[PDB]
Write a structure and sequence with these properties.
223 residues, mainly beta, Green Fluorescent Protein, 2% helix, globular, photoprotein, Green fluorescent protein, chromophore
């Protein structure tokens, strides 16, 4: 069972290759996750220079298998059971009155490391808008995610809004549409619909000279 792979502390690697309006960049993340409590600690670096979008806009893209699933719902855990073979995660994210991200990721085990490997393509952004103009506050407003059985494939889907506070006032909406499918061909758990609740905290490493994001997350699933 894939759930057995999460009983202790699991190292995490995140690799993102991005291209937003032709501005190409890479992000790496490293840390660990504890699905017993639902805690994630990760540090991300823009390894190509200055990040061409704001860090908060990448949080959802940069591993819901680490959610704390309570006892009575363990057999509704699609994300962990897909392991070690893993799952594909696809999203489209529409930024209101601005461009959009299209992301494809594979989440799987490589050795004992849970790896999230992402391709991101952004198009139709305004160069002086809130994203390419870096006009968003360095913080986060988390939102619940209603995970529904992709009753029609075998997998899951969800859609939800994320709100990014704008420095000069107001809020930038990021409308998320998500589909996940197992990579393997073994049997999938196909959960009953349920919520994921997340609390994310962004900070900085005072000793890090590169463009970076320190991220601490707590995540649980609810009936």
């Amino acid at each position: 069972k894939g759930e057995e792979l999460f009983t202790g502390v699991v190292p995490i690697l995140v690799e993102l290759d991005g291209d937003v309006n032709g501005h190409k960049f890479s992000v790496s993340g490293e840390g660990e996750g504890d699905a017993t409590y639902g805690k994630l600690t990760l540090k991300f670096i823009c390894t190509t220079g200055k990040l061409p979008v704001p860090w908060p806009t990448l949080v959802t893209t940069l591993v819901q298998c680490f959610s704390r699933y309570p006892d009575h719902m363990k057999r509704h855990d699609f994300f962990k059971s897909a392991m070690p073979e893993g799952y594909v995660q696809e999203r489209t994210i529409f930024f209101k009155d601005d461009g959009n991200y299209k992301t494809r990721a594979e989440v799987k085990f490589e050795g004992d490391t849970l790896v999230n490997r992402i391709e991101l393509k952004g198009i139709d952004f305004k160069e002086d808008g809130n994203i390419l103009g870096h006009k968003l506050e360095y913080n986060y407003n988390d939102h619940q995610v209603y995970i529904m059985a992709d009753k029609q494939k075998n997998g899951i889907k969800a859609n939800f809004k994320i709100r990014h506070n704008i420095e000069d006032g107001g809020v930038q909406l990021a409308d998320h549409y998500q589909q996940n499918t197992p990579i393997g061909d073994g049997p999938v758990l196909l959960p009953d619909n349920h919520y994921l609740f997340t609390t994310s905290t962004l900070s900085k490493d005072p000793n890090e000279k590169r463009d970076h994001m320190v991220l601490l997350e707590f995540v649980t699933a609810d009936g």
